[PDB]
Every structure is written in C-alpha cells, then in structure tokens.
Amino acid sequence: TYNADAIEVLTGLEPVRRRPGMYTDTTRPNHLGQEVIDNSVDEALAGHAKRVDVILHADQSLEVIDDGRGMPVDIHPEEGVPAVELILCRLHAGGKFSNKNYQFSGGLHGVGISVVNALSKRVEVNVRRDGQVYNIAFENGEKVQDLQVVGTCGKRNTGTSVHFWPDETFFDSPRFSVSRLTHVLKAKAVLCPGVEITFKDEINNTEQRWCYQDGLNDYLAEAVNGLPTLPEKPFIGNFAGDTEAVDWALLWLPEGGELLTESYVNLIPTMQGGTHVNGLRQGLLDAMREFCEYRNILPRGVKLSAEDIWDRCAYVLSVKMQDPQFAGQTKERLSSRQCAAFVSGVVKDAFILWLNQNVQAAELLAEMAISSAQRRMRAA
Numbered sequence: 001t002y003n004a005d006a007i008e009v010l011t012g013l014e015p016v017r018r019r020p021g022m023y024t025d026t027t028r029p030n031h032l033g034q035e036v037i038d039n040s041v042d043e044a045l046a047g048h049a050k051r052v053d054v055i056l057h058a059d060q061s062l063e064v065i066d067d068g069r070g071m072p073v074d075i076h077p078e079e080g081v082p083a084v085e086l087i088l089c090r091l092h093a094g095g096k097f098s099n100k101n102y103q104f105s106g107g108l109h110g111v112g113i114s115v116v117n118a119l120s121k122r123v124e125v126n127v128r129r130d131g132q133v134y135n136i137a138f139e140n141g142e143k144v145q146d147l148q149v150v151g152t153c154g155k156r157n158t159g160t161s162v163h164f165w166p167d168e169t170f171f172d173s174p175r176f177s178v179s180r181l182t183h184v185l186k187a188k189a190v191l192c193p194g195v196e197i198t199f200k201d202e203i204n205n206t207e208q209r210w211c212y213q214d215g216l217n218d219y220l221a222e223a224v225n226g227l228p229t230l231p232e233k234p235f236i237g238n239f240a241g242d243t244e245a246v247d248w249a250l251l252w253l254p255e256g257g258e259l260l261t262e263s264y265v266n267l268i269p270t271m272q273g274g275t276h277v278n279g280l281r282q283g284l285l286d287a288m289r290e291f292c293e294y295r296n297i298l299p300r301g302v303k304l305s306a307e308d309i310w311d312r313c314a315y316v317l318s319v320k321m322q323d324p325q326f327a328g329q330t331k332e333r334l335s336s337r338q339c340a341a342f343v344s345g346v347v348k349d350a351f352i353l354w355l356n357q358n359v360q361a362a363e364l365l366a367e368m369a370i371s372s373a374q375r376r377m378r379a380a
C-alpha cells in the first residue's frame with residue numbers, strides 16, 4: 001500500500017543524520033570545524049572577538065574557542081528554552097537572518113553548528129557571560145547535560161568554546177586534514193586584520209599563530225614568490241560601502257608556475273567561485289579590451305576573450321555583503337546575481353585607470369593577452 005502512513009516527517013536534527021550529504025562535506029570532518037570557526041570569525045568581523053583558538057586533540061576531536069560576546073544563554077522569550085539549546089538543536093535557528101546582530105557574516109542559514117551537533121558523538125559548549133561560566137552538552141545530537149553554571153570568571157571575560165567529537169560513521173575518513181585546517185585558519189588572519197588566530201595540533205605536537213595588520217598583498221606575493229610575474233608586484237584594489245565591499249590582489253604568471261586562485265565572501269572560502277569571481281573576470285576583460293582598443297594595438301581580426309586575461313591570473317578576492325546567497329550549506333559557490341555587476345564595475349574602473357598610469361607594464365599585459373588570443377585562434 002502507498003497511503004498517508006507512507007509519508008515520514010523528520011524533525012529536529014534527524015534530517016541531518018538521515019541526509020548528511022546535503023548538510024556537510026562527508027569526505028572528512030574539516031567542514032564541521034569550519035562551521036564552528038566561521039561563527040567565531042563572525043564575532044571577530046563584528047569587532048567583538050580579538051582571537052580564535054583552535055585545538056586538534058589527540059583523539060581527533062576539535063575545539064574552537066573565541067573571546068566574542070558568547071552564545072546567548074538566557075531563556076528565549078518564545079521558545080522557552082535557553083538560546084544555546086535552540087542554536088545547537090534546531091535547524092534554521094540563528095542570529096544572522098537579518099543584519100541586527102552582525103553586519104557582514106559568513107553565517108546566514110541558522111544551520112551550521114546544529115549540523116556539527118547532529119554529526120558528533122559528543123559536543124560540549126562553554127559560554128562566558130555576566131561574570132559566569134555556563135556548560136551544556138550533547139551526544140549524537142541529543143542533549144545529555146542541561147545548561148548549568150560551572151563557575152565565575154572576570155566580568156569582561158566573555159566568549160564561547162565548542163568542543164566536538166565527530167561521528168566517524170558519517171565520513172569517508174574521521175581524520176581532520178591538518179593542511180586544510182591551517183590553510184583555512186591562516187586565511188582568516190589575513191582577511192580579518194588584527195584578529196589573532198592560533199592552531200594547536202596535539203596529534204603532531206605543533207603550535208602556530210597568525211596575525212596580520214596588512215594582509216592581502218603579501219599573502220599573494222609570498223605565494224608566487226620566486227616565480228616570474230606581471231606586473232612585478234600584485235595589482236591591488238578595493239571599495240567599501242555600507243552594504244558591500246570588495247578587496248583584491250592579483251597578477252599574472254605568463255611564463256608558467258603554480259597559480260593561487262582564492263575567493264571569499266564574508267570570509268567564507270568559496271572554492272567553486274561564483275558571481276563575485278565572474279565579476280572580477282569580466283571587469284579585467286572589459287578594462288583590457290578598452291586599453292587595447294583605444295591604443296589601437298589590437299590586430300585586425302583579433303578579439304580578446306575572458307580566457308586571454310584569466311588563464312594565467314593568480315588572485316585573492318575578498319568580498320563583503322550584507323545579505324549573500326550561497327548555492328549550498330557548504331557555501332562553495334556564491335549565487336548572488338547582483339554581485340557580478342558590483343565587482344565587475346569596481347574592478348574594470350580600477351584596472352583601466354591603473355593601466356593608463358602604468359603604460360609600460362600595461363603594454364606587456366596587453367601583449368600577453370593578444371598573443372594568447374592569436375595562440376587560441378591558430379589552435380582552432
């Protein structure tokens with residue numbers, strides 16, 4: 001039979017435990033770690049947290065500590081439960097559905113930490129607020145320890161600590177990728193100037209710390225250091241408005257070499273790019289086309305295409321949006337339609353102006369793009 005009883009209604013964290021693939025990267029637990037790290041970074045971005053400490057424990061569990069405002073522990077006026085339980089056990093429950101708690105945040109779904117909870121054998125949360133320390137714990141997504149006061153601390157000492165033990169049953173490998181972890185963490189320090197980021201690995205017995213006042217430029221430069229580039233130092237630019245901002249560092253490696261191509265939205269690494277990256281690409285192409293067309297150095301029958309200025313472009317792109325739109329909980333791609341035009345406009349304007357005031361380096365770049373077009377033409 002196929003009647004009403006055939007329809008099942010999953011509630012709480014059950015959908016995450018039943019369909020893990022839709023909520024996280026099941027390759028390894030690193031992404032679970034990023035959900036937690038992102039939440040701490042959002043506090044730093046809002047200017048509340050000054051540091052985020054991450055610890056990979058010998059038992060392969062992960063602990064993330066921040067000195068932000070701390071997760072709210074008071075009773076929710078409508079749900080009648082401490083905000084903390086709500087945040088940990090309910091999907092689509094969070095403080096980033098508006099811009100009242102954070103102006104620019106990587107979080108927006110009200111799902112992250114609850115996914116960490118659903119896929120962990122155990123989760124311990126500690127909050128420091130009002131000169132008091134609170135504790136609450138879960139196992140397999142279910143609360144096993146009610147919110148309780150575990151002591152006193154300085155009134156000015158506030159923050160959140162999350163320690164979780166991933167359930168190996170949901171991942172290809174239960175081991176945390178160390179290189180991925182440090183790559184993600186260093187980037188946070190680069191993208192949020194002044195915030196101190198630390199990573200203590202107790203499996204391999206190491207400890208690192210990252211804190212950069214400048215950031216972008218050196219990050220790209222060092223990544224390509226020792227490789228011929230054009231121009232000699234990265235082309236950088238930025239624009240900041242109330243609801244949006246864009247920052248970048250880029251250059252080309254025409255003679256070959258490993259390219260660095262990273263894009264971010266509210267410090268969330270968008271590994272699959274998206275509309276913001278499309279904008280950067282289009283802007284660079286529009287400006288180069290203008291330079292070539294005006295200087296009349298474009299051979300008859302030769303038309304530049306995106307590939308001609310993108311193929312060997314190494315770049316780091318960091319965008320801020322009051323209300324981004326990602327294609328999935330993993331946030332690998334930004335699908336926010338208007339961000340393409342936004343980035344494109346800023347980049348084209350900055351690049352054409354830079355080109356016009358750096359004629360020598362510009363002509364070399366132009367030659368690089370044109371020869372690429374002819375190479376591509378002869379190929380077809």
Ligand SMILES: Nc1ncnc2c1ncn2[C@@H]1O[C@H](COP(=O)(O)OP(=O)(O)NP(=O)(O)O)[C@@H](O)[C@H]1O
Pocket residue numbers: 035039040043066068069070071072087093094095096101106107108109110111112113114160
């Ligand atoms: N370390 C923290 N400090 C202060 N508040 C926090 C912290 N972690 C979580 N919260 C809050 O709890 C809410 C729910 O977290 P979460 O379920 O991860 O949703 P999210 O922030 O929208 N992220 P995401 O689902 O990945 O887009 C957040 O929106 C914050 O209001």
Ligand SMILES: [Mg+2]
Pocket residue numbers: 086087088089090091092093094110111112113114
């Ligand atoms: Mg939630």
